Amino acid sequence: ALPWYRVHTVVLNDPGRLIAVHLMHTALVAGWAGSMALYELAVFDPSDPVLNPMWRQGMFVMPFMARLGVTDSWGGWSITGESVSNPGIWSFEGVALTHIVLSGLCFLAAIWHWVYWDLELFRDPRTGEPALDLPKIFGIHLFLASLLCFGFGAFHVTGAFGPGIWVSDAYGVTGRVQAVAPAWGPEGFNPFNPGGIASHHIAAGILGILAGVFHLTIRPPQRLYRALRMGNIETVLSSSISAVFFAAFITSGTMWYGAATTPIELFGPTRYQWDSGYFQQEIERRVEASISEGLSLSQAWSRIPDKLAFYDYIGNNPAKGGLFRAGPMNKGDGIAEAWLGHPVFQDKEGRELTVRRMPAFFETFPVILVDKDGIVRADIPFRRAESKYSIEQVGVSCNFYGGKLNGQVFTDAPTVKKYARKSQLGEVFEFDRTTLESDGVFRSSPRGWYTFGHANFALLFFLGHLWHGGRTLFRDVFAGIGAE
Amino acid sequence: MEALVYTFLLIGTLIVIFFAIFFRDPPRIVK
Amino acid sequence: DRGVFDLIDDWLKRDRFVFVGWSGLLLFPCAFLAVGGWLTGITFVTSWYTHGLASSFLEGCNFLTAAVSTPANSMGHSLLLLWGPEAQGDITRWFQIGGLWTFVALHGSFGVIGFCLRQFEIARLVGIRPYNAIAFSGPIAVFVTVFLVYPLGQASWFFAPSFGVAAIFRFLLFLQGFHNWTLNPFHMMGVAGILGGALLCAIHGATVENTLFEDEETYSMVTANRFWSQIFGVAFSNKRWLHFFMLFVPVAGMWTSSLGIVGLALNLRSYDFVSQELRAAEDPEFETFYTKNNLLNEGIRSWMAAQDQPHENFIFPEEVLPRGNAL
Amino acid sequence: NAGDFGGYTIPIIGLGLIGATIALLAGPVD
Amino acid sequence: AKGRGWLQKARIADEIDVTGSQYVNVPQYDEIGVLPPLGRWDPLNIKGQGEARYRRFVEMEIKHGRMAMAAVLGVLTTYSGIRFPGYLSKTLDLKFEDVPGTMIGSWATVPVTGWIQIVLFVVLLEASWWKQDPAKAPGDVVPEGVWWARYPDGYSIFLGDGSVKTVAEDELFLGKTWKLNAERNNGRAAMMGITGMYVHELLTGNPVYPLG
Amino acid sequence: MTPSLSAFLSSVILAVVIIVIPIGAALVFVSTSD
Amino acid sequence: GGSLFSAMHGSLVTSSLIRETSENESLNYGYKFGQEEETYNIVAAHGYFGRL
Amino acid sequence: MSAPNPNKQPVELNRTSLYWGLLLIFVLAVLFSSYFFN
Amino acid sequence: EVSFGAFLAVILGLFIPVVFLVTLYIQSEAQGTATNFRLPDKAPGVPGDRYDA
Amino acid sequence: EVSFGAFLAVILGLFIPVVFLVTLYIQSEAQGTATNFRLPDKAPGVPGDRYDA
Amino acid sequence: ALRTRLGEILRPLNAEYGKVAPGWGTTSVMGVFMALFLVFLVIILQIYNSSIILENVDVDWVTV
Ligand code: CLA
Ligand SMILES: CC(=O)O[C@H]1CC(C)(C)C(=C=C/C(C)=C/C=C/C(C)=C/C=C/C=C(C)/C=C/C=C(\C)C(=O)C[C@@]23O[C@]2(C)C[C@@H](O)CC3(C)C)[C@](C)(O)C1
Ligand SMILES: CC1=C(/C=C/C(C)=C/C=C/C(C)=C/C=C/C=C(C)/C=C/C=C(C)/C=C/C2=C(C)CCCC2(C)C)C(C)(C)CCC1
Ligand SMILES: CC1=C(/C=C/C(C)=C/C=C/C(C)=C/C=C/C=C(C)/C=C/C=C(C)/C=C/C2=C(C)CCCC2(C)C)C(C)(C)CCC1
Ligand SMILES: [Fe+2]
Q1: C68, C37 in Cβ contact below 8 A?
Q2: Helix H or strand E segment including E35
Q3: How far away, in angstroms, is A23 Cα from ligand 3 center?
């Protein structure tokens, strides 16, 4: 008589079988984490962390392992590129294998709790019916969670007894796992300050322990117990679902806008770094500093790191992919091989021309060369349009500085047109489109996919909060009402 | 083989529609 | 009753000309400010300093072209509070930078929260199940994803819809040209739900009125089931399943299309079929209706970007503007 | 990296402690 | 005028059943030190050696566990490098920083005249001041008026609004029996901890040898 | 205290003393009256 | 408006269904094909919509 | 305890619900196959 | 470029829920609950009589 | 080169008969005939009594 | 029901079902903590939104 969408409500009044299905879900989730990491370790290429990082290869669980301090592998390599001798058990493979062993043990524990459902612990001594004292259970679980929250902040993050967390510079070129001192001032509320992570978990953990002491000692008010239906297991389901989508909306914005918990060396750059020219402005700032030192343009642009130039490329923008463009970022433009250098375009009048950069909105953007005033000087016309300001007519030459083509000058129109198209996407790079049979359409980073999954999951969990919230407050009439 | 998959999906949908029309649950009026 | 909370609870639920309740403490001021803020914007407030447009009755716009336009792109995702660091308490500068848009959107968002809470409150007061609140979660999901989630994933509040008739019409063609929103399967599920809901409204109202009893039940369910079984092949036999279905399909259409808008916030769009794009690139004679549509999307993007996004200072010469004469 | 924070000591002692407590509580009462 | 009349009005009312009726209160861990995992773990049956001989062992476990808890905290503080400011012996030019934080290092470097003052303070506490009363509970050696944190049954705690809750002896984390049990168990764990830190130091020079 | 922080504090104080407290007082008055 | 009125009417009827089934049985079994009496409480739904 | 569980309930899916589910799954496959393949 | 993973997504994304629905209906037929033209449950676990009976 | 058709042969060659066996057992449980520790049929269509009542 | 060693241990932790504080209890304290949490959440939102610009904290990527 139970419909298909109500089959799991047999567990609603069975605390022993409720632990069993929760242990089974734990076994599947821990099993997924070990399996996802093992599959990811099979397809990971750790050869070049500069132009082929984890986020270019579609690594999903690997950035979260590296964020908390797991950077070495049993194969002798590390995420930073430095060859490691002995990582111990807590390598990438050891973390993956432990989640598999934990999955099997939870699977066996789920079987025991399913079979031995009728425990005296779940029975109310006054009535003999199955009962769960939910306010007391909340105090136990809040105390246990706050102990873990405090211990994670005080020992793991601060490095007192722990590895620390991933920290980097403002441009993501020197990233490493390092102990982080807590920031107790107003700077701890800067989301990009990693010191806030340590100070939050210590402060919130302490307050949660104090709240756990209160919730383990003081019983709920009678009027609050009746209003919130605290004797019903569905009222905590509705409230936990609400807290769950509340967190998922925050972690979606934190991932999308960037924070200290989502570094660009693990998840890739954000779309707002390309919008504001974040890496571009720093690149010209370092070049202009070298020019004032007396270096020529060739050597000034040669000091620019390839990692910094790779960030200033629209193919690394997470807002450039597609919903059904599956696979890694290397499946798109290709696997990055070498920075080609910075092209400088010039007409026959010595005017320095800059290609107008492509906004993330446009799938295709017109190729336009403008001077320092802002007037359009050269063009790449649309297909067979009647050209008047074309590259051939204007006569634009291109000089490359830095990279592989350092010092080279290209003046023939087909190569100038080809590099003007590549200059529209930011820094010019050479790509291996044959290893993965890359098709040339841009894909999204792990930063883009996480936000899509968790903002959509949070939206769907808002619906579940309304449904399970209504089922709690209307439990008496949910089989129907009386005829009047 | 993509067109084969598309054709199989469309023909399967039409088969499901045929079974839903002609092999439906017969409506019986309560007494 | 006993205690000051109980007198307030009794007064709020008292039968008067309009029900108030506890949700009315949030719904009534927020909804009045959102509607009043919108009527203020379409009458007096311009969009000259944010969009380079006239959008008020004071400037000569009519009801179709007036709007409460989105903030300037330089504002980002600022809350644009009246006391915020942008307007700094200046109500005039607040109107000019588009702060009225965030006023209407934020008070409107808390308004629809209060209305859904009102649906929960009256259902508990009357004693019925809260299915109208679940059905209103469809419009909530559409409003939240389109007016909040989509600009929050984009560059700024500027790319959100502006509260106006013709401004919404621009937003339709903007998402078609820039995201190929019609080719998204989530919008397709939304169209099926919304057109199916209009079908269900028309077919149920016609059937009930045409199977009426000449005067318990007012219409013949047996006759209606017999009619549609022989006309269409299948028919409803359960009246309760028929009415859950009338709830389900338009609400599921709202929820499915909202999931695609979230993807469109991060530009995770269904823009292209890659194999069809690659084959047309190597073979210029190949052409389908999807490839013709991507050509029209390029025409939308390049011809509107100069005026739709005036902050970017796009200067597009006639050579780079796509045309049908150059194929 | 191996040998840091006690090496394999704490995971071995911790796993042995969990296994011993489960075996201690496995028997029936009275 | 007695200044304690506001306490009764600020006192929270007794907890009841949700229906409205009075709550029904509705096991083998009666003695302090008898805890859920092992219960009464008495392999040598010291409880069967006599009530006088068992009363001796309760005070003996309490005293041994109390010094071991202080001893463990002392080594963990000094081996970490935490020191008092100034000099330990201005006559011997012994700064606090010069003395090793290790157990054997601190035991030898501290002067014997300094060690005598520690011992004599313990002797003074053991023989006159903190003497065990046979009528009093085991381990209750602090006399009245020596400003000790006590948790009697029904003692008052205070909430955010100023309301007062009375804490029974069986309350979690706040009752007397919880704190009495936690003193005994932390004393038992530090008893094994301090001898383990001694032998790990004897073998490697590191009291916490795997760590560090 | 920056001007934006002072503006936020003023906004919180203004919300409490113009919206919350007057509406609550009006509710208490009309509930005890009726 | 058709989608609005369809969802509105469906939610109003689904809200005021008269109890005829068990604790977690599907409520659609509470309606019998060919029955004469009303399957939902019309006055309760009308009162809800009037107060809404 | 391994007692007979009293919360065990039979599960029901009538032919109409089966047809609705089959139609939903087939139509969803028809809609999303083009996007998965490209 | 036949996307190998896309073929499994279409096949398994169709086969597995179709299998689940077919398995649910067949055991419903065995229990006599695979019709909506039957009375509500007489007792817990006891389906009501069909309208034709 | 991953043989595309070979993956479907392994997957569908395993999934389809496993599905058929699981569906047959589940409807057998609904009829009370999924145990061999029961008596033979007392009548056509009526399964025999189980060994433990 | 089955009695286990761990079940007897955890028995007092699930023995207070239905026990409530009479009346409004500590709801007034809870409302204050909820109001303080609401103000705190608005603060960290407006800091991230740059609607509250603090003294020398900058919402931008930091070094070390
Ligand atoms: C000074 C040490 C000391 C004393 C006097 C007591 C006394 C008591 N204990 Mg403790 N106990 C101790 C240390 C002690 N305990 C330590 C370190 C632990 C943790 C491992 C425990 C764990 C414990 C539990 C779990 C329980 C007791 C119980 C008891 C009571 C009766 C059982 C008994 O007497 O066994 C004590 C046995 C002796 C004193 C034997 C003499 C010392 C032997 C020879 C030590 C063996 C060598 C040792 C490992 C050091 C090695 C050095 C090497 C060079 C030889 C009594 C109050 C029961 C109870 O709590 O009642 C209130 C009970 O259930 N004890
Ligand atoms: C006014 C006044 O006076 O009122 C007083 C009253 C009163 C009640 C006294 C008060 C109190 C409370 C107090 C004093 C509490 C004190 C607590 C204290 C000091 C308790 C330490 C435990 C240490 C343990 C368990 C160690 C075990 C460690 C073990 C088991 C080890 O094996 C150690 C180890 O190294 C080895 C051997 C090998 C290594 O590989 C691993 C590790 C490192 C693990 C007040 C309120 O404060 C004030
Ligand atoms: C028993 C045992 C064992 C073993 C174990 C194992 C080996 C495990 C495994 C495990 C595993 C191997 C698991 C896995 C899992 C997975 C999962 C769980 C998945 C899921 C998925 C999903 C859920 C998805 C979905 C989706 C899709 C498809 C699309 C999109 C959307 C989504 C995402 C939703 C050992 C020896 C150790 C020990 C002893 C015992
Ligand atoms: C924003 C703002 C605000 C608010 C304000 C408000 C609240 C306002 C209101 C406003 C309003 C509230 C207005 C209104 C208006 C109205 C109107 C404008 C109307 C019109 C009408 C008409 C036109 C009609 C027509 C018709 C129809 C439709 C149908 C039938 C026929 C006839 C003809 C009758 C404040 C102060 C807070 C401050 C900040 C800012
Ligand atoms: Fe109707």
Answers
A1: yes
A2: none
A3: 13
Q: How far apart are CA G30 and CA G23, in angstroms?
A: 12
Q: Where in F1-34 does DSSP place strands (E)?
A: none
**Six token digits for residue A422:** 């590549």
**Cα distance between residue K45 and residue I32, in whole Å:** 57
Task: For chain B, give percent helix, strand, coil, nearest 5.
Answer: 70, 0, 30
Residue with CA at minimum distance from ligand 1 atom 37: E44
**Nearest C-alpha in F relative to C29:** F19
Residue A62 near residue A92, CB atoms below 8 Å? yes
User: Are residues I40 and H12 in contact, defined by beta-carbon separation less than 8 angstroms?
Assistant: no
The CA-atom distances, in angstroms, between A465 and each of A439, A456, C145, C257, I48 are 42, 14, 17, 20, 34
Residue nearest to atom 63 of ligand 1 (CA): E41
Residue A184: phi, psi to the nearest 5?
-90, -5
User: Counting beta carbons within 10 angstroms of the beta carbon of residue E192, is it exposed (0 to 12), middle (13 to 18) or buried (19 or more)?
Assistant: exposed
- Sequence-separated contacts (24+) of E108-111 with Cβ below 8 Å: none
End-to-end CA distance of chain B: 54
- Asked if E184 and E33 count as a contact pair (C-beta separation under 8 A), the reply is yes
| Residues counted in chain K | 64
A464 is known to lie in a ligand binding site: no
Nearest CA in chain C to G34: C222
Q: Are D24 and E210 in contact (CB < 8 Å)?
A: no
CA C181 – ligand 2 centroid, Å: 65
Cα→Cα distances A132→A47, A138, K22, Å: 54, 11, 20
- CB distance A122–K22 less than 8 Å? no
Q: How many CA atoms lie within 13 A of C242 on its CB side?
A: 20
Backbone angles phi, psi at A354, to 5 degrees: -120, 130
CA-nearest residue of chain C to I38? C238
Using a CB–CB cutoff of 8 Å, tell me whether A7 touches chain G.
no
Task: Give C216's contacts (C-beta < 8 A, 6+ positions apart).
Answer: G36, G37, G38
Is residue H26 a contact partner of residue I14, using CB atoms and an 8 Å limit? Answer: yes
Distance from C-alpha of A360 to C-alpha of A425, rounded to nearest angstrom:
10
Instruction: Point out which residues pair with J38 in neighbouring strands.
Output: J50
DSSP secondary structure code for residue H3 in this structure: P
Residues with CB under 6 A from ligand 1: E 31, 33-34, 38, 40-42, 44, 46, 57-58, 60-61, 64, 188, 191-192
Ligand positioned closest to the Cα atom of C101 = 4
Q: Return the closest-CA partner of residue K59 out of C75, A251, A188, C88.
A: A188
> Method of determination?
cryo-EM
Is the CB of K27 inside 8 Å of chain C's CB atoms? no
Looking at the CA of A28, name the nearest ligand: 3
Give the single-character DSSP code of E47.
Answer: G
| Run of H or E including A165 | strand A165-167
Which of C72, E8, E27, G39 has its CA nearest to residue A125?
Answer: E27
Asked if E173 has any chain A CB less than 8 Å from its own CB, the reply is: yes
Q: Cβ contact (<8 Å) for B13 and H23?
A: yes
User: Is H34 in contact with B6 (Cβ distance < 8 A)?
Assistant: yes
Q: Nearest-CA distance from F11 to chain C in Å? A: 7
Torsion angles phi and psi, residue A123, rounded to 5? -100, 135
DSSP A35-90: HHHHHHHHH---S-TTTS-GGGGT-SHHHHHHHTT--B-TTS-BTTS---S---S-
A470 annotated ligand binder: no
State the smallest CA–CA distance between residue A102 and chain D in angstroms: 12
The response to whether A7 counts as a known ligand-binding position is yes
Residue in G with minimal Cα distance to A6? G24
* Cα–Cα distance measured from residue A378 to residue A394, given in angstroms and rounded to the nearest whole number: 6
